[PDB]
């Protein structure tokens, strides 16, 4: 259905008629299939710039008496349904939480035969922890009839057990502050059907049918169409007794009025009984058209079932009538989604879904767009209204009311509707609606909170890190395909802000990710989409850091190739506080050298003299490494500054130990002798000198290496929590805390896990917990190994040697004498 920007706005205005929801389903249960039925039925089209589909807008219209059945405030017959996209596998835990956090309802898909799988169970558990209301649809009914050929009673009992299992999970993990949220078929919160053939139904749909043929309000008929209600065919009497006077079995209403009609069509059509089909179709008033009247077998069965019980209708019915609106849900989800006071002015504005109060927009993810390499911020307005041109307070993850850390007061260029793959610019957007923002990707990596009050805390933040902890070497198998890989890498780095593609000094094409899986999917996306050529990929390698933890044993000295220039320097460790401050923007390269110096002096115990003589950061001109000019009366010193800085960029990018980046390394240039003539002290002369002196100074400051460490947060039922510790105890894991959810048997275990010990972690944790555990790990900190990296037998040395060999370097680490002036 095509709509104009105006019609959309007038629909987003009535928040009471909006449905923010997602779909919880296993990919093998026809998740995308049922989703297609919805978009092909109620999909909203608009009457240039493309984006990765993150959300879909649906439109459903109902009756005055249909809307009457809604136990929440409503306004009109029109309804806007936001279908938020969900990941395909549970392993993508971080983005599973992201989608659920911006939703209020959930369409949970469950298999007829297999019932509720472990994955869907775990996800529903999380959705309930987010205070999300569920509506169930039992899919793949077709398989039960066509393959298993079960009886009506057998099919019913199967649905019964299924519904039971779902409510066992619901009643256990659903928050007590929501009341009975269990699903009941008789109440229309459960649908049945087959996405494959595109048919589905609810008890309400059939109650509406027989409401007249029995002169009964569908409320009572609905109650009879499930459970122990029996309509005796011989006496035409309703009964609660499953046997007549003579003790003969009576068929339940569900089997008699719902299943039977379907079963008869399945039987007549699949048995090619050309004489029965017509009569059976007119009986149910199912009219065929031209070509359709000649179909047979599955072909015909799919057409008949499709127009008999359109799948999308049954789903939309539950979504509109039972799923909460932004208004309803935010009243009990506000406290939970606000990392601050419950009686706050903003938290209250979120409870009331107040479009007038201070803006409280939540950014769940950044979306790749066709507008260059820019990303549009996807999220939801929980309070106030976002506007084009409006200036907003961009509050990052590390932001806190008081400090100005991780804050960016900028202006929203354009606020747009995310119509799946396309974008539609609008003026504003009241609270309760999902929306996209243009011109923020340069302030928010992925998650963030936008406000308008100078006293507003961040909304429940989703921890994330861009730090490339794992990487691989990418290489084409066919030399001719090189150009295709070069552009494929530049493309891959644009479809994901957390992916890193760069070239090592040796020229290797490097692809680095945030985790084993994340990197895995990237390499598959590359070899099939971004590139499409047969690739040779090396095994996953962990990224380390080269550092020092003492001052150089002695002054480092190095000459230039022409022997006319000398650089004297000394290396020394930088405090972790300072390295963290640098990485967190506190101490900034682009900052005024005097403002920065004051900070380093007052807050970090630096000599303001040194702090004012910072020549550069590194690597990439902003890393946690510094060059300090401590020279005295060196003529023409400034004429080599650009060279010294450049050399430092390369020296810090790949260190002397085994080619890994430096961290927390401070270089003090103590003295410099230069040739009077500039001709003999250009980049070609200075660069190698500085770079070698640095290496020499580094090696003299007792070298060490640091390893990346994850912070793992795991949700798990008490029963299987024991498996969490079982796995961690052989992964050098360090338990941080074990907390239990009030009321439920759900535990949250947080622990540190070395990245180089996390390979295959989710798979092992899976088995150790029977799939009950819900992993979620983000980079936390670097950790200096105690062992000597120069000792090939030690842990650190063992790591170095293997790396050295792999890179084809000399096995033994070079002594400082190599880089020191040879004399």
């Amino acid at each position: 259905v095509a709509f104009t920007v105006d019609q959309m706005r007038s629909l987003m205005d009535k928040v009471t008629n909006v449905r923010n929801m997602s779909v919880i389903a296993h990919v093998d249960h026809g998740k995308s299939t049922l989703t297609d039925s919805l978009v092909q039925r109620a999909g909203i089209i608009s009457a240039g710039i493309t984006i990765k589909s993150t959300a879909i807008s649906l439109y459903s219209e109902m009756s005055d008496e249909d809307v009457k059945e809604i136990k929440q405030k409503t306004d009109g017959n029109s309804f806007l349904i936001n279908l938020i996209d969900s990941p395909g596998h549970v392993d993508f835990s971080s983005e599973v939480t992201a989608a659920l956090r911006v939703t209020d309802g959930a369409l949970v898909v469950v298999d007829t035969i297999e019932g509720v799988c472990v994955q869907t169970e775990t996800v529903l558990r999380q959705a309930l922890g987010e205070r999300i209301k569920p509506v169930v649809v039992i899919n793949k009914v077709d398989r039960a009839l066509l393959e298993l050929q079960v009886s009506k009673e057998d099919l019913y009992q199967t649905f019964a057990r299924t519904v039971e299992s779902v409510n066992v999970i619901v009643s256990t993990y659903a928050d007590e502050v929501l009341g009975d949220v269990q699903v009941y078929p008789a109440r229309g919160t459960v649908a049945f059907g087959s996405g494959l053939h595109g048919w589905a139904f609810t008890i309400r749909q059939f109650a509406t049918r027989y409401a007249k043929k029995f002169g009964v309000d569908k409320a009572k008929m609905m109650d009879r169409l499930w459970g122990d209600s029996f309509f005796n065919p011989k006496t035409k009497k309703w009964t609660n007794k499953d046997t007549d006077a003579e003790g003969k079995p009576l068929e339940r209403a569900f089997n008699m009025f719902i299943l039977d009609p379907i079963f008869r069509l399945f039987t007549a059509i699949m048995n090619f009984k050309k004489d029965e089909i017509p009569v059976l179709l007119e009986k149910l008033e199912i009219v065929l058209k031209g070509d359709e009247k000649d179909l047979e077998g599955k072909a015909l069965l799919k057409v008949v079932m499709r127009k008999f019980l359109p799948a999308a209708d049954a789903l939309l019915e539950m979504i509109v009538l039972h799923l909460p609106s932004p208004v309803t849900a935010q009243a009990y989800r506000a406290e939970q989604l606000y990392e601050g006071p419950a009686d706050d002015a903003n938290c209250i504005a979120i409870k009331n879904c107040d479009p007038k109060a201070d803006l409280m927009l939540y950014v769940s993810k950044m979306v790749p767009t066709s507008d260059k390499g820019r990303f549009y911020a996807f999220g939801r307005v929980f309070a106030g209204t976002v506007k084009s041109g409006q200036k907003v307070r961009i509050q990052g993850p590390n932001y806190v009311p008081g400090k100005k850390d991780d804050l960016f007061i900028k202006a929203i260029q354009r606020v747009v509707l995310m119509m799946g793959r396309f974008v539609e610019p609008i003026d504003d957007c009241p609270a309760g609606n999902i929306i996209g923002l243009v011109g923020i990707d340069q302030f928010l990596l992925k998650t963030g909170t936008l406000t308008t009050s100078e006293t507003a805390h961040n909304m429940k933040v989703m921890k994330f890190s861009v730090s490339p902890v794992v990487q691989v070497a990418v290489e084409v198998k066919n030399a001719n395909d090189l150009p295709k890989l070069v552009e494929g890498l530049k493309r891959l780095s644009k479809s994901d802000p957390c992916v890193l593609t760069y070239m090592s000094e040796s020229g290797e094409h490097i692809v680095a990710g945030t985790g084993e899986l994340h990197l895995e999917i990237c390499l598959q996306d590359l070899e099939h989409d971004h590139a499409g050529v047969p690739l040779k990929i090396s095994p996953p390698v962990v990224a380390y850091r080269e550092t020092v933890e003492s001052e150089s044993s002695q002054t480092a000295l190095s000459k230039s190739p022409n022997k006319h220039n000398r650089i004297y320097l000394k290396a020394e460790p930088i405090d972790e506080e300072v390295s963290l401050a640098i990485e967190n923007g506190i101490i900034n390269p682009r900052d005024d050298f005097k403002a920065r110096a004051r900070i380093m002096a007052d807050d970090y115990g630096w000599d303001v003299t040194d702090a004012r003589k910072i020549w550069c950061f590194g690597p990439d001109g902003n890393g946690p490494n510094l060059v300090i000019d401590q020279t005295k009366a060196v003529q023409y010193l400034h004429e080599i500054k650009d060279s010294v800085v450049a050399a430092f960029q390369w020296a810090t990018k790949e260190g002397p130990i085994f080619g890994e980046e430096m961290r927390s390394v401070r270089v003090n240039i103590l003295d410099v002798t230069l040739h009077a003539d500039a001709i003999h002290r250009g980049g070609g002369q200075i660069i190698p000198t500085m770079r070698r002196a640095t290496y020499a100074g580094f090696l003299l400051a007792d070298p060490k290496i640091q390893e990346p460490v994850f912070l793992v947060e795991i949700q798990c039922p008490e029963q299987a929590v024991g498996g969490i510790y079982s796995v961690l105890n052989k992964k050098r894991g360090q338990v941080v805390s074990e907390e239990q959810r009030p009321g439920t048997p759900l535990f949250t275990v947080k622990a540190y896990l070395p990245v180089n010990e996390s390979f295959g972690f989710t798979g092992e944790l899976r088995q150790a917990t029977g799939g009950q555990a819900f992993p979620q790990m983000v980079f936390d900190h670097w950790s200096t190994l105690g062992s000597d990296p120069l000792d090939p037998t030690s842990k650190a040395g063992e790591i170095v040697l293997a790396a050295r060999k792999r890179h084809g370097m000399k096995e033994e680490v070079p002594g400082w004498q190599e880089y020191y002036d040879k004399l």
Binding site: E505, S506, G507, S558, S560, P561, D642, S643, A646, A647, Q649, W650, E654, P656, G659, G682, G683, G684, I687, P688, T689, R691, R692, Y695, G808, M809, P814, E818, Y819, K822
Partner: protein
């Protein structure tokens, strides 16, 4: 073709591709079998190496006095090693390691090789060199060997005409990508290459 048997030879930061000590021993032998002799090393940057080995040594304008123009090589690879690297960085400040080249000439040119104790490329030596080669500078179909600086190592200058009759192949002595600017470690010189690196006996007296 004087590169021996194997794959396509190319120059890289990672080292000279398809060039082993064994292949060198084959290329060297086959050179001598055709009346060629080894006269020293030439260090330079990768692109220059590619040009010199596949296109040949060609005359070019260089930054010195006209009379001393020619192709510069060193008997001791360590001296030539110092020039086997980029002289200018790119836009990002990258200074790549280069490659050591072996320089061969036709034995028929040997009578033109002379040696001196004087420091070359200096006006005080121009007279003695012009005496030795039997004509005024620049060098032509002849060569001169002597200290590249007082108390320094020996360098050889091939007259451009003579330089263009050379045959140049890669050395089995690698440059260090992780130590650009460092000195040549003798231990990194393959023992089997040192064995074929004896220099000819140069004349100390004019013809």
């Amino acid at each position: 073709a004087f590169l021996g048997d194997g794959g396509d030879v190319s120059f890289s930061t990672r080292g000279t591709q398809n060039w082993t000590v064994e292949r060198l021993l084959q290329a060297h032998r086959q050179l001598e079998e055709r009346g060629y002799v080894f006269v020293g090393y030439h260090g330079t940057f990768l692109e220059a190496a590619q040009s010199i080995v596949f296109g040949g040594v060609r005359a070019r304008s260089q930054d010195l006095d006209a009379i001393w123009r020619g192709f510069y090589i060193a008997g001791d690879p360590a001296l030539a090693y110092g020039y086997a690297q980029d002289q200018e960085p790119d836009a990002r400040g990258r200074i790549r390691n280069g490659a050591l080249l072996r320089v061969y000439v036709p034995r028929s040119s040997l009578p033109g090789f002379y040696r001196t104790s004087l420091t070359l490329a200096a006006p005080e030596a121009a007279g003695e060199v012009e005496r030795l080669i039997g004509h005024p500078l620049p060098l032509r179909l002849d060569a001169i060997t002597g200290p590249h600086e007082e108390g320094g190592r020996l360098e050889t200058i091939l007259g451009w005409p003579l330089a263009e009759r050379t045959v140049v192949i890669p050395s089995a002595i690698p440059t260090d990508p992780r130590n650009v600017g460092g000195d040549l470690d003798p231990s990194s010189i393959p023992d089997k290459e040192q064995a074929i690196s004896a220099l000819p006996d140069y004349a100390s007296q004019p013809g």
